[PDB]
Structure formats: structure tokens, C-alpha cells
Amino acid sequence: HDPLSVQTGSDIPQRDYIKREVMVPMRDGVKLYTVIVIPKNARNAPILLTRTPYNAKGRANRVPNALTMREVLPQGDDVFVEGGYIRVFQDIRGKYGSQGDYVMTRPPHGPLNPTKTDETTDAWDTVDWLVHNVPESNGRVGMTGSSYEGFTVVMALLDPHPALKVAAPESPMVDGWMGDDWFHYGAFRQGAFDYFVSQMTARGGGNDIPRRDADDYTNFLKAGSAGSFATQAGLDQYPFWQRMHAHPAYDAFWQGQALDKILAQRKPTVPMLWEQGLWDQEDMWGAIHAWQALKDADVKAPNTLVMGPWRHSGVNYNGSTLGPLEFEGDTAHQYRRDVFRPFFDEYLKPGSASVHLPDAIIYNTGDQKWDYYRSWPSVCESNCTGGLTPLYLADGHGLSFTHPAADGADSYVSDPAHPVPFISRPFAFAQSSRWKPWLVQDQREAESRPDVVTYETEVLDEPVRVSGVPVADLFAATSGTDSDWVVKLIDVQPAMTPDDPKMGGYELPVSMDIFRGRYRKDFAKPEALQPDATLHYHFTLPAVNHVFAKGHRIMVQIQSSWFPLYDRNPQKFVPNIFDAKPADYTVATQSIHHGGKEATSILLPVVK
Amino acid sequence: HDPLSVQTGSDIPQRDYIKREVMVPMRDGVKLYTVIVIPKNARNAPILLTRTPYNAKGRANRVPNALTMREVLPQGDDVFVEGGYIRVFQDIRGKYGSQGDYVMTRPPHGPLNPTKTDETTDAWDTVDWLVHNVPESNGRVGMTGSSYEGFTVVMALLDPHPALKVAAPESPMVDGWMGDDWFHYGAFRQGAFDYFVSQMTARGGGNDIPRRDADDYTNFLKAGSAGSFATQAGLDQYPFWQRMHAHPAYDAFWQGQALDKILAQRKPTVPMLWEQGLWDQEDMWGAIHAWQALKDADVKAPNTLVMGPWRHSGVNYNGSTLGPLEFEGDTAHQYRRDVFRPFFDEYLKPGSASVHLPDAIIYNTGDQKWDYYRSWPSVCESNCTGGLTPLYLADGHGLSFTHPAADGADSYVSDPAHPVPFISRPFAFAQSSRWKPWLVQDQREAESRPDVVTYETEVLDEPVRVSGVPVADLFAATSGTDSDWVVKLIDVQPAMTPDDPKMGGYELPVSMDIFRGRYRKDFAKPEALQPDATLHYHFTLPAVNHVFAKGHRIMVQIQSSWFPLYDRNPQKFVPNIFDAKPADYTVATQSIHHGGKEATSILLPVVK
Amino acid sequence: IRGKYGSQGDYVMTRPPHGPLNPTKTDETTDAWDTVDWLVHNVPESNGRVGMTGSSYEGFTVVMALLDPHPALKVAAPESPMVDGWMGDDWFHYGAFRQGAFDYFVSQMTARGGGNDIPRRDADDYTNFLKAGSAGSFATQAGLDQYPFWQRMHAHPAYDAFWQGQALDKILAQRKPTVPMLWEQGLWDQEDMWGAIHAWQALKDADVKAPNTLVMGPWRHSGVNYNGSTLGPLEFEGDTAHQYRRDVFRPFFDEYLKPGSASVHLPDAIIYNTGDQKWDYYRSWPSVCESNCTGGLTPLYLADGHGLSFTHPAADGADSYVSDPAHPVPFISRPFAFAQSSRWKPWLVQDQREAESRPDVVTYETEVLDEPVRVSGVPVADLFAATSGTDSDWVVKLIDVQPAMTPDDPKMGGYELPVSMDIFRGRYRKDFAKP
């Protein structure tokens, strides 16, 4: 039979870089899948390493099997591809092509991890193997990564290999209870469920949770409590959910995973560049708190904080815009080329010029430029050059820098059957395009509701500059025995913006957060609220570096639900909110006090 | 001096139709600017006439001075350009090129107009002139036009010239107080202000009212009452506003302008084609009420109602879509080609084939097809082949065709300081793109609020067909002495619509209206509402021809504000809501009773 | 199917039927047979009645089942099926080779499961293929020389025994099935234009003893399974695909698959009219063609002054244009890469004004029409052409020029909308099997 005409068998049988796939053994014999991308004719090149739970093979295949290194590696690696670096992506223990048991945000060695290995030792063994088994490299390794990839960098900094010469944790997962991915001051973030099934259903890729309605406001409201939704989704068989469910409060389980505290105790000497977006919608707490903790522990190494006009992980893509907002050029690329690259070159490419970075490099969302701050912040509640400036709530739904002498209060009814949408309906957690820029969305929809109270200054005659961390000084009462308190600090654009009409009167949030009331006194010991008693809440809000220009107004909005992002507070003290029952959800009248000795205000970091 | 090089003076000195401009004298000597567009070599051609307050020169110049008749005339005249008709546009008395005094919706001869002329005589004199002075025509005239252009048709029908062989009023202005442009059941429509300043500032073109804020929700809320906004915009010097301001109730002034009642008394024999969009956002009352009144007076002429899936005047453009909805082809062109044109040809082009139209030709928003109804409606409250089927509000925020035996009530707070946006903020009346398809927008935003009560049936196992006019049978209490009641009948799409994901769970309004409570007993004589008393309200909603298919749900939403489209009911009986003062605006608790002898329901025109 | 994803066995591209190209005991026909037999004996919830359907390669599997169908296969609906890959479906059009096949090969034959596309140098495939030179040179650079199916295709550029033995239209006509069939394809099917219509016509000519209806909508390839409201910038009367599925496909399937269901009496062809914007039900179709029809074709003649007329010009004449392979005419605007599905799908309805503006394209047109001309059938190019070379391709396009101005939709003014176009490789002028 002619083989060029009859087939009785089966028809199934130029690059500027080389890719190597290796199984790196750890101290305990578990081998991790590691991909190494090396430029052709690379010699004595530094190594840029990232450890990830998101498929190393795919991470190094942006354009699958491309002909150029620039195409095969992520957009964020553009400056390093141009600099001639070797790039390494590795699958963390128990994910994709790596062996071992996978533990979600594996705790460091201690009470929560008595084994002989963790993410610090895995990073250690990885760097050791690289400097002894990659001849094209100069033996100098730099670590970087965003989100969970940033968590792995922080974990390496607990006990770094001597060949790790510099680190750049980006929007890292530091404290998941205080203000990163799982909770914000005790208030649970319901998007976590899809993340758990997606990352822990299998070693490799997993799926999302099938939905009934296209709108998650409907899906979660019909299921009732968060635990009820988890049970219906089959999450009760997932070990990490069983632990989280059992630890709703900031007890030993969470305290033992607060990497900002742990890192400050270790005091690393590896140069660090901490980064996060001003509108980071997934890990807002991480970088800034780690950087501040190190700064307070008087760390003996470069320790610079960088904050750009970006959403979560935005630093690795185009930072020219965010939602309807426009910035001065590709701010992400600007940072990667002018700060990130030169800083990494100093420690990874001997003979490279030295850079002297200040305490903080922060984009100014008002002036539309990069600010270099030698010492930062210049104002705060204690041990700073200056103090905070209270912007008090007042009568007539006003805001004034003058303390109102007389007492007063404004009330609103919070009904858990009609919770305030965090963004316009309909929304599903799968809708990435609407999730990413959510923090910069107009708050006018919220202003129009009777379950949201809004205060604003007169139109500004002179600009007010703010740079630092604002603090909510709230004096509020609830008729119930529990409640959540959402406080938003907003820049109201000029009534009319003729050069871009859609922005006229736009209520742009510059900083907002939620606080779960049962933790007012102690995050580790929840207690019921006293009904109808005005109580004092004091908590830090996301950092600002902004200017409220002439023609704008400063606005503050307060409400008691933010759904479906945050589960509903039943407004009745129950042992565990995850297990709240239908009958537990109670309507309550909330009252915000202003003036006198209970003068609610936002402590603003005003600067000259 | 060489003229081809040195200029010491001034440099300022193929069609398939002919355009004539003529000043046609009326009986009193006033001359009206008339534009006649005639196809080349036209002989014995019928005339299609439209009388307008929107600039006849411009109306017949879609593409200015175009080389083809098809381009020079509007999209809606396409089928008549193809049929060889002569097209006439005329400026009504007092506008643009016409002489005379302009009177907004000039009332017919009677107590509101004691002069010798009106829109009826002007139309009579115009037709008389055309049949004697257009040699290329056959002396047969058909009239058509939408909105105000529809009003001029209806006015001609009161006493038509014998040469007026056929008429097509499209979304006409018939009763401005009951449910067309100025009020809906006494609730004032605040877009009217711009319309006034635009059409009554000068003989020719006018301007809009300058705004402080980009969002009309803000502009109107800060102004307070509608009269306050009017005063600030300088409307107190406009005679028409002075009259409307003095007649907020349905007194002699408005009764004397109800054309549906007047026309029924006259009983015209000119064949008529009444048209309106199912989602007509400006003149929902007109066409259907006028047609029904002629039908009831047993008019001796063809009298057919046509309702397509259109917005106001949508019949003259493309009817393939409306907002995010998609229909079966260009439904507007389908009507123009298959019904409008042949019907007009029967009476204007001797020897043309006859057509036998049914009572109503109505697009089915469920089956996605045109329905030809010999007799319509087949169900109504009295004198029909059948009756309405009550869909009762029930416990658990449900809806059921079974009368609930037990009594019950659901409450909601209505705060005039936080009125419910009729569509998402921000919105300015100038944004035509958002105004046009507003009646088909998703109602999920409103559902999420505590100042709106929502009821729904279980997901349907069997479809329910509706065809006719639904009736709100409402048993509601308010703690104030006045209130508005907004009732919405909605088709909730399947939880998931995988072919078009964004429609999943979409709350599509098929019929909604508002009722100003002070008019519960008599439209002419407003009276305060009894605080905390459950009162009976009974009123018709916009017509429906729909099928709630399997997987969908039927929903009812009730609220007490719809801003800024409708001015706010202060919820305190004041003599004139236009003049309400800030202090008058009161917060109230609303209660909708369900079951027992006060069983609130929507009387649905269910059909088999 | 055998050899792909979760299935065992060897995978052969468009596995030929048992015969000279396949001497094994199995093929797609026997695989379908066995599959149906298993279904009716192992699915208690069913009624034992099976209907088959599918588009593209999924349609090819329906056709292969029709060569010897299991008795439980009561109805079939092959959609834009792969029938003759050399005459006018996926690999060639009249011998002219389709260069997007390379990506398909690597994607579908690199592994049992999923594969990848071929890594590109430039974003524009116009540039990639023009720099590589010949099609074979591109294939060699991509590593295709190690793929058995490409080896065979490379060795059989002409319509020899290898292709003739896989012309399923001919084969099926010789087998004369008696299973009711609904053949479907888009009027602008950009991947399998030959399949459905030729298979349907061959059965009609063989006087098949079973319902045999042809359905063509205003769709791209496989468009019948999505939304048929639009295609490129064109707008049709509603979701034409859904209309078909609900009003024709479903009831037809029910008649034979749900005992007791109302019977349907479909005509020869149900075709959407791209002019009148409505569905046409043709009892006998076509009504005009070259031979054995009620009527014949009407020639539209090229004439002087670049005109077109129904009058046969008496005098002889010629218009010339220079064809330079270093500057080939882009089939759609540059840049284009086969990976760009959004641009590939509606390519047949794109404006031809860019082409008209070039000196390597000749354009002829009628005067603006005073009366409409209605067409329904298969047009035939009767081309008298000379070339200074020894081979040549000839692309002929039949176009509807929209009115000079379309004020209701301004962008369509003077739009040159192709209603029918194809290419013919010159070397096969006398015989497809002998260049």
C-alpha cells in the first residue's frame, strides 16, 4: 500500500531564547516544577524569580511558544527582557506540575506549621539550586511577584538565601483578616468562595462555582448567610474553608499569619521595594503595613514604598487609565523603567549605577504627577512632623474644618433585605472587567438612597492637599446589637467638566473601607453592641496622595452594607455571622452623631 | 487693476425632485411657510402632508440640498418616496417661516379659543390651497406626523377638508394632563421646562435652560419644587407656563383640550391609522385612547390601531432594537412598507388594491411577531368577550393568581430627600440617547432599595399570555396626607440567558405608570389623603401584548417617587405642588395591603 | 471521534470511507453505526430514535453515517459539511490552496487532545506568507513536514484518485440513502461552500427516495448555530438562524423522532433572500440552470467602457491588467492573521472598493438600475482570458453595489457587497486531474 495515498495508521506523529523545564528538589525530596527562560547568548545574566500558584508553564507562555522572549513573558517583564535578565517561574508546592501537599497561604514554621518545610525553605532551596545549576547566570537572584506571587516573596524574606540580593513584593497577601483578601476589619469578602474552588479543587486548574442567577446580588441574597452559600456550593468538604469558618475573629489562627508583624521581628537586610495600587481592590493592607512595620523596626536596608494610580496588580500592565480616569502616561511602565529596573540592576548587575530612593514614591491623583517623598508620611496620629486635621460632620449635611460646638445626629434605616450594592447591579464575581476598577466608580447611586447618609463641603475656593492615611473617627449608634460601618472619603468633581462632560459632579472615592462593629474593642474578642448607645469607632482608611482642587468638594458617605462583596451583618449579635439564620437578620435605625464631645470626623492627613 | 489678481470688492457673490417654498394664506390673512417636494416628471401624484412646529425647511432637508429626494426627506418617508408621492411640510401658525401668533397646542374653537381660526381651519385652508395649486398632484391628500405633528393631524380630523382622504396620527399629543407630555395622572413631568424655553423663546429656534450640574437629579433636587426651578430659569414670563401653573388639576382648562373626547363627539369618516410605541416615553395615552373612543362611538370609517416595539416616534426610524432589546427585523420599516403605505395608496392612488385591516395590529413582545387582531382587546373590565385576571400580591413578597384569604401588609419608607431615580444617575434631560429607551431599562437598581417593594411569582412552568390594558387595583396607606404611587409590571428574564449573558435575570418593564394620590376620587378636585388609612386606587397602565414564557417570572414593583422625570410629591397636602416649600417635604411610611378584602393586585388582560 | 481527546484509536484526518484509501474494517461510518446501536440499547430514558446533526467536521461525521446508517437513525441534518476538500471546501477551491489549513493541522494533529497554533514572526500573515515564499516553504519552516496528512496533501496537489475517493457527494449519490435529510449551509459560508449544495443536488439527481431539502440562510460558516441577525455590517430580518432552528429544523426532527408529531412537507429548498430580506420556500429549485431546468441562465456580458450589459456586444475587445506576485491583492484589508476569527468569519461580505482602486483588478458595472433584477440559482463564470505567463489564477466576483447614498445608514453608500465569488486555478482548465 502506497503511504502517500493510503493511511492505515495515525496522522498524529528561530527563537531568541531557550526554555528549560526542571524538577528542583526541596530539602524533603518534594520536587517543584520550574521553568527557566534564558536569552540566547546570555552570559553572567541576573535571575528574576517568581514562585506562583497560577501555573508556571502558562505564566512563561503569554504568547504560547513564541519566537521572541518579549512575547513569551508577561507585559510586566518588559524592562527585564530588555535588560537581558534570565526569568524563572516556579510552581509552588502542591500546584500544577509540582509535587507535595498544597496548603492555602501556607503558614510559616511555628504553631500553625510544625513540619520541616514552608514557603521560606522552598524559596531557599530554589535559589540555592539556581545559583549552582544555571551557568548562564551571575548567581545573583531578585524576587518579585504580585498578589499570591508577592506573598511568596515576603515568605522568602523571612529567611533569605544569601544569593537573594533584592526583593519587590507587589500587592502582596500579608494579613488576610485585617484588610487583604478574606476579611476587611472582620467583614467577610464573598468573592473568596470562587477563589477557593478554583485553586483547591485540584492540583491543576479548577472551575468556578455554578450559578443560578447571572447577578450575584441575587445569588447571595437568596442563599442568605455566607455559610449557607458555601454549603450549597459544596465547600464544607474543603479543609481551608473549615478552618476559616471556625475562626471568624482575629484569634491565634490569623495572628500567626500576620506577615507584617513577623517580618518586622526578623528584620531583613535585603533591599526592598514595596508596591501597591492606590485603588488596589484585593490587597490594600499588605505592602503599606509591611513597609511601615519595617520602617518602625528601623530596618537596616533600603525600604521604599511605591504607590501608583492602579488597581490590584496594575503595576504589571498599562497604568494610563483606570475606569473612566485618565493619568499622565503609562504610569506602570514609568515605574517599571525608572524605579524598578534601575533598583534591581544596582544589586543584580555589579557595576550598575547606584540609586538613592526616598521613603516613598507616590503618584499624586490631584496634581497628576509622581511625588518623591524623602520622609513619609509627614503627618499622622503620633510620632510625626505634624498631626491629622479633622474634617467634621455638621448640620445640613455639611463638612467643616471647624469643630461644631452643638450636638446633633442624622439617622438612616439599614435593612438587610435591601442591602446597598457595592457597584451597580447586576454584578457577578466572574466579571473581571467590572471588578478590577470598582473602587473608582461614581458613588452617586449610593447618595440617592435613604439607607446612606452623605455630607459635603461647600465648593472649594482653595485646594486642600492630603498625603498620608486618613482615619475615621466615628461616633455612631445602632438600634440593633451588631452593625457594619462603611465610610467613604470622596472627591466630588466640578459640577460641570466641559472637556469631559460625563465627569461633571462625579463622586470619586479616593479612600473607603468597612468596619465590623462587633470588633470595636478587640479584634480577637467579639462583643455585642449596646442598642441606642452612641459608640466610638476609630480605624484607618486606605492611603491618599491627592489634591481636592478649586471647584471640587470633599464628601463623606456612611452606610451599613456593601453587597455582595461583603456579607450582610445581621444587625443582631450572633456567635458566628457565617451561620446566621433567616430570622436573625434585623432591620435597624443607625444614627451618626456630629458636634460636641462625640463629633464624628475624618482625620485627614492635610499637608501644606 | 487686474481682477484675477487684485480683489478690492468682496469674495462673497442634477436633482430628481423640485422643491417649492410658498406662503399659503389662511382665511384671516396670516401666511404659513409651506415646502413642497415633488419628484421629477411627477404627474397625478398624491400629496402627503405634515404640519409642524419644528422647522419645515429643516424637516424637508434631512441631508441639506441633497441630490436625491430619498436623502432630502426623513427616513420615515422612505416608502412614500419610493411610491412617487409629493411631500409637504408646513410651519404652523407662529413658528419659523410662518406669520401669526403662536399658542402652545392651540385649543380648538370653543371656550379656550374664541377666535375665528385654530389648527383645524389652518389645516382646512392648507389642503384647499394644495389641491387647487399643485398641478403635478391628483388633488388627493393624506396627513401624517408624530408627536406635535400628530396633534396637527388630530386637529384636522375635527373638521377635515373633503380632499383629506386618509390620516395617520403617530404618537399624538391628545390629553397632556391624563398621560401624554405635561402630566401623568396629575404627576408633573419636569422635562417640559426645556421644551418650553426651546419652542417659545422665539418664533424660530430657541435654546435649552443653562444648568449648574451635569446631573438633573441634582439640579432639580437643589431647586426644590418644580415651580422653584421654573422661576430660577425665568419661566415666570412665559404665558403658557403661567396657565399650566394656575391649573395643576384636571379642571376646565385641561378638559377643554382632551382631544379624544372631542374627536369622539365629531365622529370623523376619514379612514384612520392610529399609531404609538408600546414603550412610548412621551405620548403613551394619545393614540390608544383616541382610537378606543372612536371605536366606542361606532365611527363609520376604517379605524385601526398599530403598536410596535418602539420608543416615541420610533416608527419613523429603525425598529430593530430598543436599548438592549432585539426584535425581529426593522419592525418600523415592516409597518411602513406592509401596512402604512398600502393603506394610504388605497385612498390616495385610485385603482390601488384594497386592504382590509383588523381592529389592531400589535407586535408581540414575547413571541417576537406581529399579531393581527380582528377584534381588540378581547378582555377588559366591561363590555368585552372576557375579563381581567387578577395577579394578587401575597405573603413572602410573592404573586399568585389565587386570592390570599388572610390579610397582610408590607411597608417601605419614602423620603423625598432621597427620591428613587427613574433611571440611573447621572442623567440630564439633554441626553436623548438615555431618554429614548428609558422604559425598557433594567429595574434591578430600584429593587435593591428599601424605598421600593418588590413582588414576584415563582419561575413559570407554563407561559402566560397578556393582551390588553392592565389595571392597577391598589390598596395602599401612607402616613402623610398626599403621595404618589408608581406601579410597575415586569417580565423577569430567565435567571441565566447563555446566548446573551447580560440579560440574565433582567427586570424588563412591560408596563408602568404613576398616580398622584390627591386625585384618587376626582381628577378635577384634589383632596388630602387620610393618614394611615388603606385607600383604594384604581387606574389603567400602558397596554401590553406579551408572553411571559417558561423560565421567566412576573414581577410587580411599587414605589412613591420617580425622579427627576416627575416632580416630588411632598407627602403633605399643599394647595399646589408646583409651589411646595422646603418645609413641606415630609418623610412617610407607605404600606401596601395584600389579601382579604383589600387584596392589591394587577388586573392582567390574560388571554388563551 | 476515534483518535481525539478522550477516545482511543488512531486519528486520521477526514478518515476516508472503506475502499482504496481505507482497507481497514472500520471507518467513520462503522463508528457511527456502532455508536447508535449502543445508544438505543443502553439509554433507558430514550425512545430508541436517533437524529444526527453537526456543522463543519461535525457535519462530515453525519454524512459518513449516511453512507450506511443504523436503522434507528431516523433523520439527519448535515450543516456546512466537509464533502469535497479539493473542489471547494477546506483545503482547495478549484485547485487553489487555502493557506489557513496549516494552523488547523498543527492544532488538530499535534496531539490526541489539544494542540497549538504555529508561532508567527509578524502580526500580519500577508507578510509572514509573502516572506516565506511558497506554501511548502512556509510548511517546512513550521515543522509540518513531519505530519503524515501534510505529506499526503503535498503529494497530491491535483484532483487525482486521492481526492476523488473522498468526494462524498459522488459516493453518497451512489448509495442513495432513505433517511430524511435536511442539508444546510450559509450563503456566505467562508469554509465549506461546496458541501451541502452539491451533496443535496447529487441526491436530487439520483432521485433519492426520502425527504431531501436544502436550506441556505444569510450566515457565515456554522452561523446557523448562533445568532443570524447580522453578518459584518449587514442586518437581516431578525435572528434568521433561530427562525430556522424553531420553524424548520425542530419540527422536521420531531416528525421522525417524536411519534405522533405533526408532519411537515418541506419544499426542495428554503432560502433566505438577501434582497427582499425574507425566507423563500421553493417547491422546485433551482428553476433556471445550464441544462435540464425549466429555464436557462441569462448572460450578463462585459463590455466596453468597463460596462456590463445583458446585450451581447458584437465587436471584439479586451481590457488588460498586470498581475505581480510580489504585490498580491489582499483578500481583506491588511493587516490580517488567520488567528483573528472576528475578521475571518464575515470576510465574504466585506466592501470591495479597496480592490477596485487597484490597477491589478479590473472592474465592470451596469448603469444604476431602473428596474430590479431577481436572481436565484448558481451563477456560472464564462471567462475568456489570456495571460502572458504559463499558468494563472482567476478570481471572479459578482457584486451588488448599494445606492450611491444610503441616508438611513450612511456608511453603506456605494458599498460593493459581494454576493458570490470564487477562484479558479488555471492549470486545471481542461482537466482537474491532469494539470
DSSP of B203-263, one letter per residue?
Answer: SS-------SSS-HHHHHHHH-SHHHHHHHTTGGG-HHHHHHHH--SSSHHHHTT-HHHHH
Of A213, A418, A496, the CB nearest to B450: A418
Closest to A525 in 3D by CA, of A573, A580, A474, A473: A573
Q: Count how many Cα atoms sit within 13 Å of the Cα of residue C349 in the half-sphere of its side chain.
A: 20
Residues of A in contact with B504 (CB under 8 A): 213-215, 426
Q: What is the DSSP letter of A116?
A: S
What is the architecture, at CATH level 2, of domain C1-89+167-283?
Answer: 3-Layer(aba) Sandwich (3.40)
Cross-chain Cβ contact A6/C20 below 8 Å: yes
Q: Nearest-CA residue of chain B relative to C407?
A: B71
CATH of domain A375-608: 2.60.120.260
Spatial separation of the C-alpha atoms in residues B197 and B189, rounded to whole Å: 15
Cα dihedral angle (B167, B170, B174, B179), rounded to 10 degrees?
160
Give kind and range of the element (H or E) at residue B35: strand B31-39
Hey, what CATH class is C91-166 in? mainly alpha
Q: Which residues contact B53 (CB under 8 A, 6 or more apart)?
A: B91, B92, B95, B102, B148, B199
Q: How close is the nearest chain C Cα to the Cα of A431, in Å?
A: 22
Instruction: For residue C427, give the amino acid letter.
Output: R
* C282/C377 Cα distance (integer angstroms): 11
All three cell numbers of A593: 452623631
How many Å lie between the alpha carbon of B410 and the closest alpha carbon of chain A?
A: 13
Asked if A505 and B448 come within 8 Å (Cβ–Cβ), the reply is no
Distance CA A84, CA A349 (A): 10
Task: Kindly provide the b/e burial profile for residues B183-211, where b requires at least 16 CB atoms within 10 angstroms of the residue's own CB.
Answer: bbbbbbbbbbbbbbbebbeebeeeeebeb
Alpha helix (H) ranges present in A267-340? 286-296, 331-335
Nearest-5° Cα angle at B458, B456 to B460: 115
User: All 3 cell numbers of residue A339?
Assistant: 524605579
Nearest to B344 by CA among B170, B172, B167: B167
Q: Does A182-257 match A375-608 in CATH topology?
A: no
What are the boundaries of each domain within chain B? 1-180+258-374, 182-257, 375-608
Per-residue exposure over C177-201, b if at least 16 CB sit within 10 Å of its own CB, e if not: bebbbbbbbbbbbbbbbbbbbbbbb
Let me know: does B307 contact B275? Beta carbons within 8 Å.
yes
CB A399 within 8 A of CB A391: yes
B321: enclosing H helix or E strand:
strand B321-322
Lookup result for grid cell 441606642: A532
Count of CB pairs separated by less than 8 Å, B with C:
34
Question: Which of C237, C276, C369 should be substituted to probe chain B, the one whose Cβ sees the most B Cβ atoms within 10 Å?
Answer: C237
Residue with the three cell numbers 401666511:
B31
Sheet of strand C181-186: strand arrangement = C50-56, C73-81, C181-186, C212-217, C269-273, C278-282
User: Which of chain C's residues have a Cβ under 8 Å away from the Cβ of A7?
Assistant: 12, 21-22, 148-149, 152
**Alpha-carbon span B399 to B389, nearest angstrom:** 13
- Of B559, B417, B217, whose CA–CA distance to A453 is shortest? B417
What are the cell numbers at B98?
A: 410662518
Chain discontinuities in chain A, listed by preceding residue (C to N exceeding 2.5 Å): 13
User: Cβ–Cβ contacts within 10 Å for residue A254, how many?
Assistant: 21
Distance of CA B343 to the CA centre of its chain: 23
CA dist B159 and B268 (Å) reads 8
Look-up: residue for cell 545573583? A140
Shortest distance, CA B300 to any CA of chain C (angstroms): 36
Residue A430 is placed in which grid cell? 466572574
B391: left (phi over 0), alpha (psi -120 to 50) or beta: beta
Provide, as residue numbers in chain A, all residues whose Cβ is less than 8 Å from the Cβ of C116: 64-65
Q: Which of A157, C21, A109, A221 has the alpha carbon at shortest distance from B454?
A: A221
Contact C183, C200 (CB under 8 A): yes
C-alpha cell at B32: 404659513
Q: Domain C284-435, what fold?
A: Jelly Rolls (2.60.120)
Rounded CA separation A33/A57 (Å): 9
Resolution in A: 2.0
Q: Which of B277, B183, B205 is nearest to B562 (CA)?
A: B183
Quick check: B482 and B576 in contact, CB under 8 A?
Answer: no
CA distance A249 to chain B (A): 29
User: Which chains have at least 3 CB atom pairs separated by less than 8 Å from chain A?
Assistant: B, C
C202 vs A421: CA distance, rounded Å: 62
Number of helical H runs and strand E runs in chain A? 16, 28
Radius of gyration of chain B (CA): 25
Rounded to 5 degrees, φ, ψ at A186 are 90, -15
Could you tell me the end-to-end alpha-carbon distance of chain B, in angstroms, rounded to an integer? 90
- Do A410 and A453 meet the contact criterion of CB atoms below 8 Å apart? yes
Q: Provide Rg for chain A, Cα atoms.
A: 25
What letter would DSSP give residue A354?
P
Task: Report the Cα–Cα distance between both ends of chain A, in Å, rounded.
Answer: 90
Class of domain B1-180+258-374: alpha beta
Helix axes A286-296, A148-157, angle to 10 degrees: 20
Chain A residue with minimum CA distance to C12: A11
CB B289 within 8 A of CB B319: no
| CA-based radius of gyration for chain C | 23
Task: Please report which helix (H) or strand (E) contains residue A408, including its range.
Answer: strand A408-414
DSSP B308: E
Cα–Cα distances in angstroms (integers) from residue C360 to residues A167, C66, C101, C363, in the given order: 60, 45, 26, 10
Three cell numbers at C261?
Answer: 408529531
Q: Which residues contact B562 (CB under 8 A, 6 or more apart)?
A: B419, B420, B422, B484, B486, B514
**DSSP 8-state class, residue C288:** B
Beta strands in B333-451 (DSSP E): 360-364, 369-373, 389-394, 398-400, 408-414
Q: Give the residue among A89, A123, A469 at the shortest CA–CA distance from A268.
A: A123
B17, B524, C67, C208 from C205: Cα distances, Å: 53, 79, 17, 8
Among residues C136, C177, C170, C137, the alpha carbon closest in space to that of C153 is found at C136
A100 backbone φψ class: left, alpha, beta (φ>0; ψ -120 to 50): left
Please count the residue pairs, one from chain A and one from chain C, whose beta carbons lie less than 8 angstroms apart: 62
Quick check: helix, strand or coil at residue A152? helix
C10: which chain A residues are within 8 Å (Cβ-Cβ)? 9-12
C407: Cβ–Cβ under 8 A, 6 or more apart, which residues? B62, B63, B66, B70, B71, B75
Q: Indicate left, alpha or beta for A183 from its phi (over 0: left) and psi (-120 to 50: alpha).
A: beta
Is C11's CB within 8 Å of A9's CB? Answer: no
Run of H or E residues at C31:
helix C28-42
Determine which helix (DSSP H) or strand (DSSP E) holds C42, and give its type and residue range.
helix C28-42
| Cα angle for residues A61, A62, A66 (degrees, 5° grid) | 65
CATH fold, domain B182-257, is alpha-amino acid ester hydrolase ( Helical cap domain) (1.10.3020)
Do the chains contact at A425 and B419, CB–CB below 8 Å?
Answer: no
**B416 and B561 in contact (C-beta within 8 Å)?**
yes
Chain A environment of B421 (Cβ under 8 Å):
445, 448
For residue C149, give the nearest of A11, A64, A65 by CB distance. Answer: A11
User: Judging by beta carbons within 10 Å of its beta carbon (0-12, 13-18, 19+), is residue B45 exposed, middle or buried?
Assistant: buried
Query: Which residues from A are below 8 Å from B208, CB to CB?
Result: none
Exposed/middle/buried for residue C113 (C-beta within 10 Å: 0-12, 13-18, 19+): exposed
